[PDB]
Design a protein around this ligand. Structure first.
Ligand code: HEM
Ligand code: HEM
Ligand code: HEM
Ligand code: HEM
Ligand code: HEM
Ligand code: HEM
Ligand code: HEM
Ligand code: HEM
Lengths: 149, 145, 161, 162, 140, 165, 147, 149, 147, 147, 140
């Protein structure tokens, strides 16, 4: 009987979120749209820049880092398309938290920014959307990640 | 030379988009692959003792399978840039390397995807085209080719 | 079918134009268009309808009656077989116990199983009978403004026994 | 809408408050016949069922749902409607087999043939149910759980009777 | 201030409103009909394409070649390097004809007009208006 | 294109689980004999019937007959029936009765109860056939020959199961 | 030989599979492989297109050539449901090819094959017969006089 | 062969060709629309002028010639409305060729013009049409006529 | 007596059969036969309409009279689904008939019959009762203020 | 706590029952009873609103206050199907309440109850839970930057 | 000349054409887009609401506050006494900004324009045009 992130909302999300990938050859979309989200993070909190040394963040267009940008949006994507049938999603995200756990130097307050970037970042890249809906769901994804930190 | 054939590379890139769809059918499209695989190799379930791979309809497992397709989506997404592929793909190597996977199994998981795609897809696709591309990815994760 | 065409197919649809049903010879390759040439409505047959709803108001009757003077078949060309019909209506009001029986002449078409009545009075109300095709004890036929082709009032007729 | 065709040979269209009245308002007087007055459907204790798909709320995944009729009264002076009380019950899927249980009241309309219910008041998760028995027999249905305000269609379940 | 995120959005909205086939021609001819009613002199240079009567064919042909150009432009608008190349080749076609530098600045005003009715209230003017400038200046 | 259970209760199930040897619907309508009914395409069955043509390849109305040759069912992925067949045309062009033929592969859904045949290795035109057994019975069938790409119709033809034995 | 009608609907779908995107990554790689397949059978033609720096396969310029070939080619197709606007735009596209040196009436009939040898590898369902028939009546009319 | 003048095309033709006769009292239409086609022929090839002496072509509005203008379009009309069910059409046109055979001084090259007049003449008198379609069918009608000359 | 409503739909179809064309050949021949039937019963009226060269049955002018009668008459009908615009246009059409001499209130009630005696021979299905009822309330509102 | 979605459709009907009219007789009497119920629990607030002649319950002015409260409140609701235009108009409506003195963060959380206190008595079917949830996220965004 | 009846009609027609929800915003923005194309200077005072680009949000917000005002006005338009009170409070908001008295007279011309297309031929111009004056003069 829990209220937040009700059924009818995520149906709106999946519909709006799918307007981007209606185009074919969308590899370049989410590489680029992913390349911005990590850099725009570094210019707010400079501390996190050290964490991405393993992927060589110093090269923005660099191949070794680009392939990392896919994996984050793609990992986010399966989360959204799985919003329905909740009991699976809990297990899905649980495996991401543990994936961020063994990595050291990841501070809980980071995500709080990463949400605020994305919450105000998203409205530029879509045609229409209800901000109230997205606000509910992304509190679901983000807050449940980091529950291991 | 019946290799990735850089034109044919993007053939499957288009077809895959039509098969791997939106909505909850994807979760169903996953179930097919695994239910197919295990029937070819009964003893392969032992490798999944950690994920509750005993029964395949359990929620904890459903999550597992999406990441697998989710992961494979990244692969087929980019066969255009031979650099970024080798980067992204090389990541998968260290994922599987820490345990014993015979070259017999992911030969069968190859056979599994083909059949499922054919059914799921709109009556038209070229096997020998698909056969090459995913096999290139298989040579990838195995670590040596 | 298409427009004025008629669908003869029992198990293997064959689409034929309307003018060849009871033509006199085999056109449908089934052979199923020649079985039906027996006419269903014989002279002396008397149908009585009850009202369904009525907006074309001459007398807005409770229920009206229909009888056959005589059917007749033009010998040589017989998809259509013309009719003489009375239409009796026994009204009642404040004042009067009025009556009516206007004669008219329609035709029954073996093609689409419809019968027609050409306007009995100058008011231009055609009565459009339609059987289902397998029954012939009742039809759902209803009145139409002959000029405009608009459904105005329905009646459900029955044969009397 | 707001009227119900009669049951007989010749279809008329008569207003919904005039069935099972004790006065014949049709042509043939279809309204007096036990092919209509039969109460077999709202006799106390009957219960409908059939697993529900949820579109609008709770997203629980299809699980059984029953409706049941706890007590029925028909007032001698206004026989047009059968006032009644019910209890809706549907299986939440958590771990153990469990069920939340709304409680209901509403009327059964001989016109539409459709009983319709509503949540009582101060009841957790306030839903209402609309069952149309427009099929031939007095069993089976096409119901729907609705939100009581909008009559917006929350969950649709095609229900039978055991 | 454009070229990144704020550029990407122009692509998606270009796909939708621009339509397809018989719907495309009807779009183009609905554009020019705006500006010629506003600025009557503009039909002087079109005597080559029989711009006497825009509804006539052969102009219909022209105006589609026009919009097709924006496709080439807007399509490659992500990759900055290759962008200038088309902008370079494009200006060359407009060197040999009598123009005013004010007609260009007029054009983008009446183009973003017509997209209004089909998109109603949904789009970023800021994204378009500034990012069509990056197309228009390359022609000067 | 998803399988609809029906009965006391009803809801969607994705076409790829229909007859899989696992319970997928709640009341098991999908693993039943009357829906699975493995053989409506058992080899040797022959279908026949006429075909009008309102599409391309304009010619007189004539008779056709598809005959199923092959059948296969991989007992790991049991959900579809891969099969071969041969397509016959008894049309009279002129000066003789000339008979076209070609071989065709394709498959047969249990969910949608409709088989689909595409011509193989055929440089010549030979337009593909598509059936459906919507009748609920296993003799009759509605088919129409379609272009392989757009899938828009042409040549609506009906067929009957030629008598066994 | 008679573009007919159904053949055009056949095209409109075929062309919609190759062209579908707002990015140019795909539309480039396909058309580049057309000429890359052309030059292997007529190396003499490669002596032309020197203005565009043909010698560089990867140039910051050469793409800006092929891109306009597509958008020109795609411009043809989207007119097939509306004729009489084709002729006008056809005659125009013809004259832009007579103003230069080295047009082999012979080379047009060459590239007609070039697609027929490099299409069936990008798509899956494809009609060779259709695409080959309605494509000549395009090219046979852009090589109307000579060159 | 087998390909040209496919089924789907002539359905377009009959639909477009029927837009003219939607109006009643169309006798005057096709008299006038027929009166132009013969005169506009004489001003290209002057030779044919001699052939129409029997119908008195010298009078444009003349009754004796007007009644001839109907019979040509009307004869063309039944050809178009009969395009479907081909085996009849062959016989239909075959009877026109033989009708032009016994007439002397009718040169095969004339029709080649008469097509070019009509092919570019028609686009003025109709709302919309696909030139490619009409081109296919009129090659069918004209080329098969004159096969006796 | 009460134009009612259904009578108007009855008209709108009847009038659509006679008026259907972009040519004037038919609309002329019908209305000319109205007056040609009128003058047979009121030869006195024929003394009027001298301004239009009535004496020539086929004049290059006289047609240009009857044509404006139709297009005026047809202008009435196409207003019946929208009233209140009728009165205005009715009152106008009235005043154009009082500015001359020789227009008798008796003449209008005559032509009311003129259509009825010879209006149908053109159509097949026709309602005499309807056309006759709604036509008076048109004409009886023209002769109100006129002698 | 998460306005969600369904709750908003729940509102849009509830609000449509109270607001339905072109006359102001009803919209006034309802909102006046809101504050009339408010002041009973916070008489201190009544010391504010002196600018509008509060002390007269039926003034020719005071109505002209409550009327703009409704039309402002109703202006919020008709945006819930379109967000991002809410924030802008939300932030605006916030600042109009910080330019004065005597507006306590405690007062807003009071009127949240005031509707729940007596808004049902006007309607019949009513969802307390819904109206109460989506109303805070309106008001708790007005008192953010205010004391 | 504005009276009990001829006023009443404006209320009923205000209900219909004004619409609801997402349909309301689309109405407002379709209004201003009329006048700014006609009288370009009018966008000078809106630099506070970023009236640079009307399609941008925050102006969308504004223009709805505008129309909402007419509701308050037109809604109470029957009772004459209480009418002036809102008209009194309304003018106060417009005192402190640079206006011309001609822009008002312009406004009602282009407002009754847009209602034309949605109502076609059905309404009393006389009722509106005169009874919007009783709203407009109270602002002077
Ligand atoms: C919001 C949703 C996010 C998702 C779904 C996500 C997902 C992932 C996943 C799956 C990986 C592991 C890649 C692999 O094992 O192949 C990864 C890596 C990483 N993520 Fe995230 N992440 C998210 C947000 C963040 C945020 C906000 C931060 C930091 C502020 C962060 C920092 C990292 C870092 C540092 C790595 C290290 C990768 C490496 O060393 O190669 N992530 N992310
Ligand atoms: C194209 C073929 C394959 C791809 C692309 C693939 C990809 C992946 C990916 C992306 C993960 C995610 C790991 C994570 O999120 O931490 C994973 C995990 C895994 N894969 Fe695969 N895989 C493939 C084939 C196989 C096969 C054939 C097997 C075994 C028969 C296998 C066994 C596993 C196991 C056991 C894990 C989970 C390890 C754990 O839970 O500790 N994979 N795979
Ligand atoms: C805004 C972007 C513009 C683009 C991308 C563009 C593009 C083009 C193109 C591609 C052509 C034809 C080249 C060919 O047929 O081979 C052309 C021709 C022409 N353009 Fe534009 N154009 C633009 C703006 C303008 C404007 C504002 C005018 C104003 C009148 C204009 C006037 C013309 C004229 C008159 C021609 C015809 C040249 C001729 O017939 O020789 N263009 N333009
Ligand atoms: C098959 C269809 C073809 C189409 C639709 C086509 C169309 C075009 C178009 C639109 C341009 C740009 C013209 C401009 O900017 O005004 C172009 C450029 C060019 N095309 Fe083609 N083309 C085709 C095939 C060919 C072939 C086969 C050749 C030579 C063998 C050729 C040679 C050229 C050359 C040399 C240019 C560059 C013009 C220059 O030097 O400035 N094209 N083509
Ligand atoms: C394109 C379709 C045409 C059709 C369907 C057509 C049809 C006819 C027919 C049926 C007649 C004979 C009338 C009768 O039997 O009583 C006729 C007469 C004739 N036609 Fe044509 N015609 C066509 C085109 C032409 C053309 C192109 C020419 C000359 C260039 C031509 C020259 C004649 C002549 C000279 C006669 C002699 C009629 C006389 O003297 O009475 N026709 N046409
Ligand atoms: C029955 C319906 C009739 C209608 C709707 C009608 C309408 C008209 C109209 C519109 C004109 C042209 C006025 C103009 O150009 O401004 C006209 C002309 C005229 N009508 Fe009628 N008319 C009718 C019957 C009659 C009858 C019965 C008479 C006399 C017996 C009559 C006498 C005339 C005359 C004399 C003119 C010529 C005006 C002139 O001298 O220039 N009309 N009518
Ligand atoms: C609950 C939702 C509320 C809304 C939507 C709202 C909205 C408004 C609006 C639009 C105005 C008119 C502003 C103008 O004309 O520019 C106004 C005036 C006012 N509001 Fe509210 N209000 C609310 C609640 C309250 C509360 C609870 C208080 C005090 C406890 C308050 C105190 C005032 C005062 C004092 C004014 C008068 C401003 C003046 O003196 O001119 N409001 N309100
Ligand atoms: C026609 C009736 C009009 C009404 C009912 C009206 C009403 C209002 C209202 C309610 C406000 C905002 C008050 C607030 O937010 O607290 C306002 C602001 C404004 N009005 Fe009007 N107005 C009208 C006409 C005009 C016209 C014709 C203009 C012409 C430019 C104009 C320009 C403005 C401007 C610039 C503001 C902005 C004040 C600011 O942002 O600080 N108004 N009006």
């Amino acid at each position: 009987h829990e209220h937040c992130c009700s059924e009818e909302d995520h149906r709106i999300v999946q519909k709006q979120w799918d307007i981007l990938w209606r185009d074919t050859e969308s590899s370049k979309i989410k590489i680029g749209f992913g390349r911005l989200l990590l850099t725009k993070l570094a210019k707010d909190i400079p501390e996190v820049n050290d964490l991405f040394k393993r992927v060589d963040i110093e090269h923005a267009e660099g191949p070794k880092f680009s392939a990392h940008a896919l994996r984050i949006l793609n990992g986010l994507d399966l989360a959204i398309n799985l919003l329905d049938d909740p009991p699976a999603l809990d297990a899905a995200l649980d495996h991401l938290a543990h994936q961020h756990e063994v990595r050291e130097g990841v501070q809980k307050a980071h995500f709080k920014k990463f949400g605020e970037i994305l919450a105000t970042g998203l409205p530029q890249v879509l045609d229409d959307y209800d901000a109230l809906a997205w606000k509910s769901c992304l509190k679901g994804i983000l807050t449940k990640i980091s529950s291991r930190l | 030379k019946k290799q990735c054939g850089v034109l044919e590379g993007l053939k499957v890139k288009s077809e895959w988009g039509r098969a791997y769809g939106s909505g909850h059918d994807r979760e169903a499209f996953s179930q097919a692959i695994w239910r197919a695989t295990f029937a070819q190799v009964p003893e392969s379930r032992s490798l999944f003792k950690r994920v509750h791979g005993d029964d395949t309809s359990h929620p904890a497992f459903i999550a597992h399978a999406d990441r697998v397709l989710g992961g494979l989506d990244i692969a087929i997404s980019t066969l255009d840039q031979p650099a970024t592929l080798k980067e992204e793909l090389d990541h998968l190597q260290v994922q599987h390397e820490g345990r014993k996977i015979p070259d017999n199994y992911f030969d069968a998981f190859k056979t599994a995807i083909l059949h499922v795609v054919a059914a799921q897809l709109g009556r038209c696709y070229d096997r020998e085209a698909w056969d090459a591309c995913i096999d290139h990815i298989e040579d990838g994760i195995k670590g040596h080719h | 079918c298409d427009e004025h065409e008629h669908q003869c197919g029992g198990d293997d649809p064959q689409c034929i134009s309307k003018l060849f049903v009871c033509d006199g010879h085999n056109d449908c390759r089934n052979g199923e268009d020649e079985k039906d040439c027996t006419l269903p409505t014989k002279a002396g047959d008397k149908f009585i309808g009850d009202v369904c709803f009525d907006h074309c108001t001459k007398r807005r009757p409770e229920h009206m009656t229909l009888a056959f003077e005589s059917s007749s078949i033009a010998a040589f060309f017989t998809p259509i077989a013309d009719l003489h019909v009375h239409i009796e209506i026994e009204s009642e009001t404040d004042e009067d116990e009025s009556e009516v029986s206007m004669p008219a002449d329609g035709e029954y078409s073996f093609a689409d199983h419809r019968l027609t009545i050409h306007p009995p009075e100058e008011d231009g109300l055609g009565l459009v009978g339609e059987f289902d095709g397998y029954n012939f004890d009742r039809f759902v036929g209803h009145i139409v403004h002959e000029l405009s082709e608009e459904v105005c009032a329905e009646f459900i007729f029955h044969r009397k026994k | 809408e707001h009227e119900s065709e009669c049951r007989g040979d010749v279809p008329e269209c008569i207003h919904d408050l005039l069935f099972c009245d004790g006065e014949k308002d049709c042509r043939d007087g279809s309204d007096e016949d036990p092919e209509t007055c039969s109460l077999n459907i709202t006799h106390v204790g009957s219960s409908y069922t059939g697993l529900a798909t949820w579109t609008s709320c709770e997203d629980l995944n299809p699980d059984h749902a029953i409706v049941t009729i706890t007590a029925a009264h028909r007032k001698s002076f206004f026989p047009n409607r059968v006032w009644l009380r019910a209890t809706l019950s549907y299986e939440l899927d958590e771990h153990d087999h469990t069920v939340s249980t709304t409680q209901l009241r509403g009327f059964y309309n001989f016109g539409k043939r459709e009983l319709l219910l509503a949540p009582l008041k101060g009841q957790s998760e306030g839903y209402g149910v609309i069952c149309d028995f427009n099929l031939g027999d007095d069993d089976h249905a096409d119901c729907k759980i609705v939100v009581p305000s909008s009559l917006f269609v929350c969950a649709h379940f095609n229900a039978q009777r055991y | 201030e454009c070229l990144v995120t704020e550029s990407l959005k122009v692509k998606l909205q270009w796909a939708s409103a621009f339509g397809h086939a018989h719907e495309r021609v009807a779009f183009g001819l609905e554009l020019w009909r705006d500006i010629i009613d506003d600025h009557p002199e503009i039909k002087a240079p079109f005597s080559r394409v029989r711009g006497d009567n825009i509804y006539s064919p052969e102009f219909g042909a022209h105006s589609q070649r026009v919009l097709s150009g924006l496709d080439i432009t807007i399509s490659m608008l992500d990759t900055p390097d290759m962008l200038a190349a088309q902008l370079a080749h494009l200006k060359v076609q407009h060197v040999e004809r009598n123009l005013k530098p004010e007609f260009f600045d007029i054009f983008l005003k009446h183009l973003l007009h017509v997209l209004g009715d089909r998109l109603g209230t949904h789009f970023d003017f800021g994204a378009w208006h500034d990012c069509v400038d990056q197309i228009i200046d390359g022609i000067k | 294109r998803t399988f609809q259970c029906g009965g006391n209760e009803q809801e969607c199930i994705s076409d790829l689980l229909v007859c899989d040897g696992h319970k997928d619907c709640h009341n098991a309508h999908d693993e039943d004999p009357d829906v699975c009914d493995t053989s409506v395409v058992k080899a040797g069955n022959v279908f026949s019937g006429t075909s009008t043509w309102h599409g391309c390849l304009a010619r007189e109305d004539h008779v056709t007959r598809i005959t199923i040759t092959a059948s296969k069912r991989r007992k790991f992925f049991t959900a579809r029936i891969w099969l071969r067949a041969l397509v016959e045309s008894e049309l009279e062009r002129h000066g003789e009765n000339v008979t076209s033929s070609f071989n065709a592969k394709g498959y047969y859904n249990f969910a949608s109860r409709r088989l689909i045949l595409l011509p193989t290795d055929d440089h010549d035109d030979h337009l593909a056939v598509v059936c459906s057994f919507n009748r609920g019975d296993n003799e009759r069938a509605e088919c129409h020959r379609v272009t392989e790409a757009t899938l828009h119709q042409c040549a609506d033809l009906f067929v009957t199961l030629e008598e066994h034995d | 030989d008679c573009c007919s009608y159904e053949d055009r609907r056949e095209i409109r779908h075929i062309w919609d599979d190759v062209w579908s995107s707002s990015f140019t990554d795909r539309r480039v790689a396909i058309v580049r492989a057309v000429f890359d397949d052309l030059f292997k059978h007529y190396p003499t033609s490669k002596a032309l297109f020197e203005r565009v720096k043909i010698d560089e396969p990867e140039s910051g310029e050469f793409k800006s050539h092929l891109v306009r070939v597509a958008n020109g080619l795609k411009l043809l197709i989207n007119l097939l449901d509306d004729t009489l606007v084709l002729q006008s735009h056809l005659g125009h596209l013809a004259d832009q090819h007579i103003q230069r040196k080295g047009v082999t009436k012979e080379y047009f009939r060459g590239i007609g094959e070039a697609f027929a040898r490099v299409l069936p590898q990008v798509l899956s369902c494809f009609n060779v017969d259709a695409w080959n028939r309605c494509f000549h009546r395009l090219v046979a009319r852009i090589a109307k006089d000579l060159p």
